[PDB]
Every structure is written in C-alpha cells, then in structure tokens.
Design a protein around this nucleic acid. Sequence first.
RNA 1: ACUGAAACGAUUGUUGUGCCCCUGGCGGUCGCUUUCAAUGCCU
Length: 69
Amino acid sequence: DQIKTASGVYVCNHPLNPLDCPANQQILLYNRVVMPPSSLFSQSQLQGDYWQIDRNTFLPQGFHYGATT
RNA sequence: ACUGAAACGAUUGUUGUGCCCCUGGCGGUCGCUUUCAAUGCCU
C-alpha cells in the first residue's frame, strides 16, 4: 500500500555498491566513500527502474551480488 | 574468508613525612555541738 514501482532518472540517496549494479541500471552521478573491500556510493543519480518506498527515498531495483562480473 | 579469522593500556608503586588539646585556675566563702541540769535524798 505504500511502495510504488517506476522507471526514469532518480537520486538514490541511500548508499549503493557499484559491484552489485546490473545492466538496465546505469550510474549517471555518484559521490563515493573509499573503503575496503570496495568503495561504495554514499549518494548517486541513476537511470533505470526503482521503488519509491516512502515519499522521500528511491531504492534501486534488481541489484544482486557481483552483477558487474 | 563480515573493511574477515586470534586480540588485557599492561607491569610496579604506603597520601607520605613531623606535630603535647596545649597554656592558667584554692570547691571557695561564713558557721560555738549549742541550749537546761544540785552527786542528790536520810544517818
């Protein structure tokens, strides 16, 4: 009742791991946190599919472990 | 292998050493064991 599904350009505003990013997502802008074993994004603008899970955050859809490999 | 696996800010150490509750101090001052009494009664 409070999530919805959409597609377009979105500011993620949660952290997000670039290694887990699939095709049908692309990263347009990112700000990064340099960290072992691999750096995260702390903020990113993406193009692709998402879930607006409350009226002020947008979560990337379709992420899975190591999807860039 | 959770940027992972194990992971003692630890060991030793006296709040110590010296110190007089001390000095001065009249239980003092006043006070009648007092008041009355037949060695007596007779030979």
